Amino acid sequence: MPYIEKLELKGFKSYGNKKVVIPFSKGFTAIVGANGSGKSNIGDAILFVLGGLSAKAMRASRISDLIFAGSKNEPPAKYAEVAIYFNNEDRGFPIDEDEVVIRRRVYPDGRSSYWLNGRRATRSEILDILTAAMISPDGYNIVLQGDITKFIKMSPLERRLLIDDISGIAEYDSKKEKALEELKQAEENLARVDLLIKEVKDFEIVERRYLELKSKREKLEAEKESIIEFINEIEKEKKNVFMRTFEAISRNFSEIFAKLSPGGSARLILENPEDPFSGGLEIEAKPAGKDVKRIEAMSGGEKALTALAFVFAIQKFKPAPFYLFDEIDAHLDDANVKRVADLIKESSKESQFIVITLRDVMMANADKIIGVSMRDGVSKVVSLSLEKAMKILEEIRK
Amino acid sequence: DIEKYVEELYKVVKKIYEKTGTPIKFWDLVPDVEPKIIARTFLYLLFLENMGRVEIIQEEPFGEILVVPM
């Protein structure tokens, strides 16, 4: 799967007029620093370059407030710019390049421009390429500030649509639409032949025409019947693929939640198991020694562990190219943060993980750590490899 | 809670700098060969740098890191 090699920021929020390059581990990167350092702006930068339209979602009041406003030693920027570099050696992107670069600029007048590997592109073209690579602009794998609350307040219908997507049943809806088109034409042709037969009811002429119409009708009726069977089959297969997906993720979710919350347990619930597509997807969890609660009623740490168990339940079934977390630890003590970080580190063999944090227990598990600090109203970064650090210090222990 | 450990590390940085006058290698500041302690030392320095009490110097990405008090 593709992964993020680096992110380049220029004139974006607290990042000044000199381009700042943020490199990433293929596995687990932690983005760390003081609150107020600009470390969280890196999350907003990724939402931005992947096409985010909502200033609030990028922690700004208007889109133009994403533009660096100047500092002690710097003038304001003419525009905000972010470029993201994906490794594409396995062609997760339908582009014949070992590297896919997406670049976005926004200007004080509020307009945005996009580039795909140096060539201009519309936002729609960018989203199409990200969809083809199964990279979401703001999907379930991106959990920034406020997104755990959003997942808690999410409707059961929206929650099921997430599983619909992961399961891949959209190909079945497509096949069904094409079969309904064929059925439509069959019915139109049947009604046409039926009108022509009614009118028909010189002997040789009328008998010839009646026999040819009766034969065309017989072919149309068989064609109609086989399309209806095909539609029935498609509907069964769609339900089957979805249920296989749901049951595996449901199992994952229960296991993971029991691991994050020792002595606890939880279940995914289909509001209509008989016809899943007529209802939502609900969540109930029972923390150790507490009553069964339903996810919308959950608070604090239980709420965050539940949302995280759901994310990892999906990533264990179908891993996304990357996951981007910020504020997921705000209501977790060190013991709980340890369990999440171990889960992240174990999953980071199959997906890229970027975690913005100042919790050292989360930090400890990372392959690389990007430290962010604000110098004179301008954010700057320092990069550290933990493997390299471990080796260098073990050798100094002599 | 943590403020005293960050301040302790600052005083260490300042005392060593008053004796050598030269930038201090990050590696020489890390008290244990354990990933959490490497991470915590790095973090405490980033806290100090965000407050303007030290400057962290790195020429190349993932290159040697040096510390100078301000």
Numbering used by the authors:
A (entry chain A): 1 to 201, 973 to 1169
B (entry chain C): 143 to 212
Give the text the authors published on this PDB structure.
Multi-subunit SMC complexes control chromosome superstructure and promote chromosome disjunction, conceivably by actively translocating along DNA double helices. SMC subunits comprise an ABC ATPase “head” and a “hinge” dimerization domain connected by a 49 nm coiled-coil “arm. The heads undergo ATP-dependent engagement and disengagement to drive SMC action on the chromosome.
We noticed that all residues on the Smc head domain, which were cross-linked by BMOE when substituted for cysteine, map to a relatively small surface area.
